[PDB]
Swiss-Prot record, chain A:
Positions on the Extracellular side per record topology: 1-41
Positions bearing carbohydrate: 10, 24
Residues of the full protein shown: 1 to 47 of 428
Function: Receptor for cholecystokinin. Mediates pancreatic growth and enzyme secretion, smooth muscle contraction of the gall bladder and stomach. Has a 1000-fold higher affinity for CCK rather than for gastrin. It modulates feeding and dopamine-induced behavior in the central and peripheral nervous system. This receptor mediates its action by association with G proteins that activate a phosphatidylinositol-calcium second messenger system.
Entry similarity comment: Belongs to the G-protein coupled receptor 1 family.
Disulfide cross-links: 18-29
Protein name: Cholecystokinin receptor type A
Protein location: Cell membrane
Length: 47, 8
């Protein structure tokens, strides 16, 4: 995306991070960005 | 689909 590219890669999705080193596949809070572009963040602001 | 909820 042209408007705010650095926010749509660092962070990416509207689901917040919870990353624990003890767990291998960390699916706590954040769902893994698929696809990483404008996507669900643009639809939640209405765009 | 993500572009789909409001595709307009």
């Amino acid at each position: 995306m042209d408007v705010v590219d650095s926010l749509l890669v660092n962070g990416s999705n509207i689901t917040p991070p919870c990353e624990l080193g003890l767990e291998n596949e960390t699916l706590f809070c954040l769902d893994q960005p698929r696809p990483s572009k404008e996507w669900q963040p643009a639809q939640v602001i209405l765009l | 689909d993500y572009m789909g909820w409001m595709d307009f």
